């Protein structure tokens, strides 16, 4: 056994004194974030159109040209036109009696043109309901057969059909609400909110003033039930060159909003640090980030829905959970969050604690940054709280153990100083140190008996050793941890049953009845551990693959009919099926 050295240091007497470090100032725990309990309503940018109901009144005018051959008949042309019903026929025939006259009279291609149904005299025809289709709105018409002229052989003849159609349609408008489109596909180049009264004349129109009338005190008569309505309304009636549309006039402000309510958060926590507010919601797992200054709702164009929906939702959420435990402090506050979110926040305070330029906000489509800000902060605050508690406990343990190190210096100053300097040293209020030389190739005697005085016998093994090989064998005595002392001064009385292990160079030497028996390895004695185990493993690497529930090619294929692809096929028809180059003379 030679993996361990041996050591000789003299008596420590010198100016090299050393002291232990005194207790350190342990760190203070971080105080913690102060929150404000509160109620929030979160708003996004409105992307939905403004939707309203309208009624179309038009006449399908059809004039056909038939040539009558000997055996057959051939259409030579079919002319289809859409004629608007006049204002006076909507009010005094259709809304009044449920009838429409059999003559269309209208201006077309800068000419007043008239058309009689079946080329017959004018009569009033009853509007009857249309044939039912699924997922269609209601409709009414006057005739269901086309009129074609009767046969006179080898002549061209003409026949006119007039069908008065009334249709209910859905109408859609998008900001700045200068136009709207109907369910037919027909644009109307007038604001839905246009009118002659109540200041509405500032709204857009691109039609002449004789095309627009308003009827106050309008009572709608249902065309199926034949029932007149009980409450009046103001109707806008606009005659276009193809149809006349009718709709209710409403004021623009309580109908339209630039924002729309997205989330109602009953428990919204507000924290202030770093010159910002952090609005955390534990239910939807988001944190929003805003500046300290509130946002003025006078900066939002068409933003009257925001204060209405906020005050209504806050009062429900206060009257559902916070009824007996909290009070509202102040009025609702408005904040613009990063990503384009408007937050209406109502601060609360518990009953225990109560001792004393116009513009458009653009929202992002991905809330994932706010949900990553939540999950990061929730893990960060927990790992900083736990590792800070370990750091205050590690400092307190290392200060508490210093008392055990002061009582152990006086017992064994050799081993305590050699454990706190970093090198084996000798030591003997301060402590004075000395560095040993390191010898090896030591021989041990076989007798622990003092021959001079037979009634005594040495406690520790006798050794003989050499500093280097050119030096004499120095007589000494084996000490603690392979320290070979220079004096033979460890005496003790001789007893019975004497049995000893002593550490001798990487293994134990065994003496029985003051006589050398045999040397051992350390792998012979049973090892007990002073140590407390702690098996910390590392967190392994993980790879995040791209993952989507629908690719962008899937969301575009979800539509039934693609306008770019149908027009690309249809306009290639003469390049596939005709010849556009040849001219016959």
């Amino acid at each position, epitope marked *: 056994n030679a993996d361990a050295q041996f050591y000789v240091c003299p008596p420590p007497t010198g100016a090299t004194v050393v002291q232990f470090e005194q207790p350190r100032r342990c760190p203070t725990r971080p105080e913690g974030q102060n929150y404000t309990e509160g109620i929030a309503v979160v708003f996004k940018e409105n992307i939905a159109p403004y939707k309203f109901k309208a009624t179309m009144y038009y006449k399908d005018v059809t004039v056909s040209q038939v040539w009558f051959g000997h055996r057959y008949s051939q259409f030579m042309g079919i002319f289809e036109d859409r004629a608007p019903v006049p*204002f006076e026929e909507v*009010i*005094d025939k259709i809304n009044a009696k449920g009838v429409c006259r059999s003559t269309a009279k209208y201006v077309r291609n800068n000419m007043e043109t008239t058309a009689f149904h079946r080329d017959d005299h004018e009569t009033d025809m009853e509007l009857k309901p249309a044939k039912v289709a699924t997922r269609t709105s209601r409709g009414w018409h006057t005739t269901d057969l086309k009129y074609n002229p009767s046969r006179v052989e080898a002549f061209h003849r003409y026949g006119t059909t007039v069908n008065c159609i009334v249709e209910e349609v859905d109408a859609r408008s998008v900001y700045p609400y200068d136009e709207f489109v109907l369910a037919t596909g027909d644009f109307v180049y007038m604001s839905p909110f246009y*009118g*002659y*009264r*109540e*200041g509405s*004349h*500032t709204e857009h129109t691109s039609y002449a*003033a*004789d095309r*627009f*009338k*308003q*009827v*106050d*005190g309008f*009572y709608a008569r249902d065309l199926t039930t034949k029932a007149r309505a009980t409450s*009046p309304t103001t109707r806008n009636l606009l005659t276009t060159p193809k149809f006349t549309v009718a709709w209710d006039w409403v004021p623009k402000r309580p109908a339209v909003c630039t924002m729309t309510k997205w989330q109602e958060v009953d428990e919204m926590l507000r924290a202030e640090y770093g010159g910002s507010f952090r609005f955390s919601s534990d239910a939807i797992s988001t944190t929003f980030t805003t500046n300290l200054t509130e946002y003025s709702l006078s900066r939002v164009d068409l933003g009257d829905c925001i204060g209405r929906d906020a005050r209504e939702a806050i009062d429900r959420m206060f009257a559902r959970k916070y009824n007996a435990t909290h009070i509202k402090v102040g009025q609702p506050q408005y904040y613009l969050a990063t990503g384009g979110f408007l937050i209406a926040y109502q601060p609360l305070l518990s009953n225990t604690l109560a001792e004393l330029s116009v513009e458009r906000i653009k929202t992002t489509s991905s809330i994932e940054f706010a949900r990553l800000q939540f999950t990061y902060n929730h893990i960060q605050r927990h790992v900083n709280d736990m590792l800070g508690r370990i750091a205050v406990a590690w400092c307190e343990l290392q200060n508490h153990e210093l008392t055990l190190w002061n009582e152990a210096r006086k017992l064994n100053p050799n081993a305590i100083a050699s454990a706190t300097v970093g090198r084996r040293v000798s030591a003997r209020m301060a402590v004075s140190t000395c560095v040993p030389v390191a010898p090896d190739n030591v021989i041990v005697q076989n007798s622990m008996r003092v021959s001079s005085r037979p009634g005594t016998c040495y406690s520790r093994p006798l050794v003989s050793f050499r500093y280097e090989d050119q030096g004499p064998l120095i007589e000494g005595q084996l000490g603690e941890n392979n320290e070979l002392r220079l004096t033979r001064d460890a005496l003790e009385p001789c007893t019975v049953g004497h049995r000893r292990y002593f550490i001798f160079g990487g293994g134990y030497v065994y003496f029985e009845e003051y006589a050398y028996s045999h040397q051992l390895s350390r792998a012979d004695v049973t090892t007990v551990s002073t140590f407390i185990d702690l098996n910390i493993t590392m967190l392994e690497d993980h790879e995040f693959v791209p993952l989507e529930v629908y690719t962008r090619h899937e969301i575009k294929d979800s539509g039934l009919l693609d306008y770019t692809e149908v027009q690309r096929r249809n306009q290639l028809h003469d390049l596939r099926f005709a010849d556009i180059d040849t001219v016959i003379r």
Partner: antibody
Amino acid sequence: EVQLQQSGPELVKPGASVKISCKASGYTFADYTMHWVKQSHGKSLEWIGYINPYSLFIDSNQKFKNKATLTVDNSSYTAYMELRSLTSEDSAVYYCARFPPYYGFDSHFDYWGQGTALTVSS
Amino acid sequence: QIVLSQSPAILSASPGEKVTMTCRASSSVSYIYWYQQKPESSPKPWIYATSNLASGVPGRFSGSGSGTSYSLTISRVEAEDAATYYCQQWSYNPYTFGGGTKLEIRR
């Protein structure tokens, strides 16, 4: 031609009620609105309100809510204005006027009555 | 109630002179409407839809304006053109009339 014959009781007691009429002739009485205005001693013209003889819809000045009520006689082609609780400031010339039953650019008082002159005194 | 201040309160004119009378509104109105009242007689329609001339009025009258500012002009003033002229609006409830502008002829 179009004429609005307007006659009513002209001398009345304070704290009473009077009914002015405006007989219409020369046009269909049911497809125009009948309006009423007030001209006190040449100071201004104040609009009272109107009535549609067909749908019986009424839109009125809120200044005259506790003062005037409007009605029609469809069989007689006459409109009526009833002025209750007559004080002396009600003494004025009251006119009747024709107007279209819609709001266009053309819509204006195109025919008038001659005016009944009311006097609240003793 | 919307107000129609109608300046001047009284204007004097010599026969042949071009004169003008204004009507300015408190809020914006869609159209303006003019009426003529001679004493012991009803008002008669004079100018409708800010520019159009009523049935039987002379071509020497013209109107102009939009929004909150309106005007009535005579190219050469005759002696029968001597009455009060009222501007009125119906864009708001109630319909209101202006204060009137009295036209006096010089001799």
